[PDB]
């Protein structure tokens, strides 16, 4: 691996309170501007935003099972090799086999890890006790010399070589602290720097330092497992970890199964010989921060990669295509839930995560400079976390559901640099990021229509309709509530028949009246009011009262609708929970017209 | 660069402004004297008033969710050094031969913020340039850093050549950054009581001005290497009237007031080479260490002004039966908690033209080359954008006819007014007279002699607008009656926008408005685009005992130019009858109803037949 995808946009942002409990949240506020090329008159600004929350008071304090996944095939490749021939004594590394296994699985560590890092990053609190689980403190060490003595053992140890405690003292007691943390025997070559203790004492650090440490043996450990090839899969535990510690509670209802799947993802206990890393594997981070750099800087870039985390989901997930046009991925299901658990549709979003889970580590990999695994070993990991969060017999908040859209975790939409990197099906359909961070992206004003004509008071053209998302017009009208989202209207619909209608209390006519509550994110879920058959929209674009008088209203011209709309990110900011954005939007979920449609539908397959 | 040039510089303040309550004027008397009949003058004083916006205005939040320009890069010889500071360190050789960006607009408003507060306050040390948040601002240090971290494009980085050269510089981009708190990023800080916490001597307020000053211009010349002049030009005077409230002449204009002051930018970064010879550089304002604070503020305040005043001479023309009116807004949908969504849509609709008029006025009032792709343009048109859709109760919003582009009046401002490009001006609305000049005018509009009844003449005057023919203000700055002789024929038909003083509803004075700042006839006042009959009393009643003649102008006055000239500008504390307001109508008129019809439906809807009965 060489460049990992880091860009200090969530650091820049300068957070000011931590976070002790679950009650409040730390919410990260991007602008976005939207003009048409048309005319600039035309214009909105809406306000993403991501709300982080600690899962629990003492998220990182978890009962260590031991038990799930367990790679056992991960072994160094020659340069690592040789390098660990040079831990035996002299004698012995001369005339060792040439073709040696040293198999590694640092994965609990990494897990463990990245959970105390989010933890850090919420509470800004982080020592030996949180890195040890309340275990350094009477962790005895078996002291063999020389590492001849390890197949002394009547297991397999993690090892903790001499070269590395020299080379980087850090490296080598954050790797202490850690296989503390998971139960893990350790070896080391000198027990104790006092001659005759049985327990190895820790130079006590500074937190900032402590942190500095914690980060660059992630960055180690993701350098160990990448060079045997189950990089992807070290980073799918790592990035398990932080989203263990920390809930970024999402944008949609349904959206947080992948939170749920992350949750659920455990390691077995590590193993395996830690040498001297390779001087020039990871290049460089994007990003460039100082030894013992303030929790500010810190919780900054870790919180970025938490949300840019987040955001690969949503950024990367396979369009299902119906009548070969790419639709966002919804699942639907006759069947009535039954004490929040959804079967079938547990069984639909396990088929679909299949290919889901492909992407998605594929991409996950490509944002951490890692090269994605040949094989699909870590999918079909989270997969399995999948399955296992499908068939839990507990009732469940996001399989309450009847007709769900999975893969939405977090607007990925101002938090990249760059998209390129990234393979992802979505963003050919175009349901996937709308601008760029740092570049103005003209993209298509709304779906190809056709104007089919205009009326006295009213204008209508025929959309040849996706989603509400691949019209991203509607947002600049969504925003401006004096006379903008109220002349849309569907009164011109023969049959009004949406799946994720959006505001269902007021069924049981204007576009208004069909929106979700969007309050967090004005932005538009990518399978928000979707229809497959082409609809037609009348625009009010006058108003003519009863008396005689011809009011013109700013309802956009047709050069507006029918011309790109540009795009620029604004700043990112930190601030508070308030009551406006915690309003949850209520939406249509339940069988519908379209919804028997979709299970018909061609679904090429 | 010169473009700006010495008026108010070398009038001379003295007084330290320490509230909001309290302001400074800069009164610029003028003469005006008829070419016909040198007898015929008055002396009118035009005021300036200039006030701050807060107490503690300069230390508003940054947030960092603003304007974000990109795509600004170096020149030729800028990426050659940057390259050169870059290579020296090898967690910098990594970005050797990519294109670097600079974005300081951030600092720049800051420092127009900031320079604006000790202009007014005289007051300024490392908090008020820092927000007062130097004291623990960390700097991650370019030798101190992991081999595995790398500078981002992000990063605003002062290479240690920039110290080298000029400490001056170096610590203001410091403060300011620290103000836009950015990833500032040195090649060594001198651990010295602080791992990262970056000491600094003390500063008397003259040095730390001067420094402030010249490191201002580094960042304009920074910016317009780039082409990006004006994009790192406006932000300095958004800062500037961010600070200092610059009193407006009418409560229509000023809009333009918030809306630079609802413009912000996103947090700074690039690298700061150090100054190339002069490429703004060369053009050196003040050139003494630690200056005078009377002369900076001086020019600080001419500029604060001369911005100000570019707004009504950067104002799109409002074509009406082919006659050019100064763009005046009108709605009907009455005003509902203080607002009208549709003057705002309106003001929207005009501001994309006038948003790059003002900024091609800015950049050929500052010199800096203009750019084909207008991001300032855009920049300004979203600060106006977010003022419009403001869900608060807004003043200068609540009527339902106004007129937005004119917030200072620019006359008698400006060495000369020749660059600047003005559709306004080639009409008859934009200076009245040029300062150290005699500027002759049209003394009324197209004008014909129609009868002499009894201690009366009437003319017909194709009236257009109140400021469009001067010799009223000649009559009612007239040590004898103010305009008390002149009046109108009123008919069905002339109907009078923005019409003077409503609360009385013949003589002409009623229907002006009683400016108390700002003597010179606001334009758009008295609009009518029908023509007007007009009779001045020449004598008194006859029939009576006396029949006695008044200074009343005669014929040639009132058909002959005028000419006017400046004065001096004195600079005068807070008077009382200065903040007298005029009670202006700002009602939907009929003659709101032709303009409505008129987009409503077309043009040709009001063409000859507006006026009624000949």
């Known amino acids: 691996g060489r460049k990992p995808m880091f860009c200090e946009i969530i650091k820049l942002a300068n957070r000011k309170r931590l976070i002790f409990n679950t009650t409040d949240e730390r919410v990260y506020d991007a602008r976005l501007n939207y003009c048409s090329t048309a005319d ?5 600004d809406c306000h993403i935003y991501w709300r982080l929350k600690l899962r629990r008071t003492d998220a990182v304090f978890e009962e260590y099972t031991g038990q799930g996944y367990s790679l056992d095939t991960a072994a160094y490749p020659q340069q690592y090799t040789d390098i660990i021939r040079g831990y035996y004594s002299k004698h012995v590394s001369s005339s060792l086999a040439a073709n040696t296994q040293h198999f590694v699985n640092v994965l609990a560590m990494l897990r463990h890890a990245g959970a105390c890092i989010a933890h850090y990053c919420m509470t800004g609190k982080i020592d030996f006790d949180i890195l040890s689980k309340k275990k350094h403190k009477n962790k005895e060490v ?56 049985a327990k190895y004492s820790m130079p006590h650090y500074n937190p900032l330092q402590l942190s500095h440490a914690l980060h660059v043996t992630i960055f180690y450990m993701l350098s160990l497992m990448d060079s045997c090839g189950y990089g992807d899969d070290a980073v799918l535990a790592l990035t398990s970890g932080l989203h263990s510690v920390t809930t970024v509670i999402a ?40 030894t013992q750099p303030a929790w500010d800087q810190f919780a900054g870039i870790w919180d970025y990669v938490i949300l840019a985390t987040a955001a690969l989901v949503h950024l990367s997930d396979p369009g299902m295509t119906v009548n070969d046009v790419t639709y966002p991925t919804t699942l639907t299901t006759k069947v009535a839930t039954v004490d929040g658990r959804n079967s079938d549709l547990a069984a639909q979003m396990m088929h679909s995560a299949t290919r889901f889970c492909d992407i998605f580590v594929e991409n996950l990999s490509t944002f951490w400079g890692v090269v994605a695994n040949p094989d699909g070993n870590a999918s079909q990991a989270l997969l399995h976390a999948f399955n296992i969060v499908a068939c839990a017999v507990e009732p469940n908040r996001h399989l309450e559901m009847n007709v769900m859209a999975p893969w939405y975790w977090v607007e990925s939409s101002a938090l990249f640099c760059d998209y390129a ?13 709308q601008c760029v961070y740092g570049a103005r ?7 190809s229509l056709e104007f089919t004509g205009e009326a006295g008071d009213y204008s209508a053209y025929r959309f040849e309709w996706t989603t509400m998302r691949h019209n991203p017009l ?9 006379d903008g989202l109220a002349n849309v209207d569907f009164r011109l619909r023969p049959f009004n028949e949406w799946l994720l209608e959006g505001q269902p209390s007021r069924r049981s006519d204007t576009l208004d009246e069909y929106i979700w509550g969007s309050t967090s994110c004005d932005l538009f879920h990518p399978a928000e009011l979707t229809s497959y058959t082409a609809v037609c929209v009348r625009f009010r674009n006058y108003l003519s009262g009863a008396d005689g008088d011809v ?46 449609y979709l299970a018909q539908a061609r679904t090429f397959g």
């Open 40 to 44: 600039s008159t035309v214009q909105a």
């Open 142 to 197: 078996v002291t063999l010399s020389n590492a001849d003595s390890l197949s002394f053992l009547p297991h397999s140890a993690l090892y903790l070589p001499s070269p590395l405690r020299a080379s980087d003292p850090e490296i080598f007691n954050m790797l202490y602290l850690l296989g503390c943390a998971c139960d893990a025997s350790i070896a080391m070559d000198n027990i104790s720097n006092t001659s005759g203790a």
């Open 251 to 290: 944008h949609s209802d349904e959206g947080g199964i992948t939170r749920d799947a992350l949750r659920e993802l455990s390691y077995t206990q590590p193993y395996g010989t830690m040498p001297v890393p390779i001087a020039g594997y990871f290049q460089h981070i994007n990003v460039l921060f100082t």
């Open 421 to 433: 990197p990234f393979r992802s099906p979505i963003s050919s359909a175009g349901y996937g990021p």
């Open 441 to 447: 992206l003209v993209l298509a004003a709304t779906n």
């Open 474 to 482: 509607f947002n600049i009208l969504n925003k401006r509530v004096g």
């Open 551 to 596: 009011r013109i209203l700013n309802t956009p011209t047709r050069e507006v609708i029918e011309g790109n709309v540009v795009t620029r990110c604004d700043g990112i900011r930190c601030l508070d929970s308030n009551k406006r954005i915690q309003h949850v939007p209520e939406v249509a979920r339940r069988y519908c017209m379209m919804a028997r």
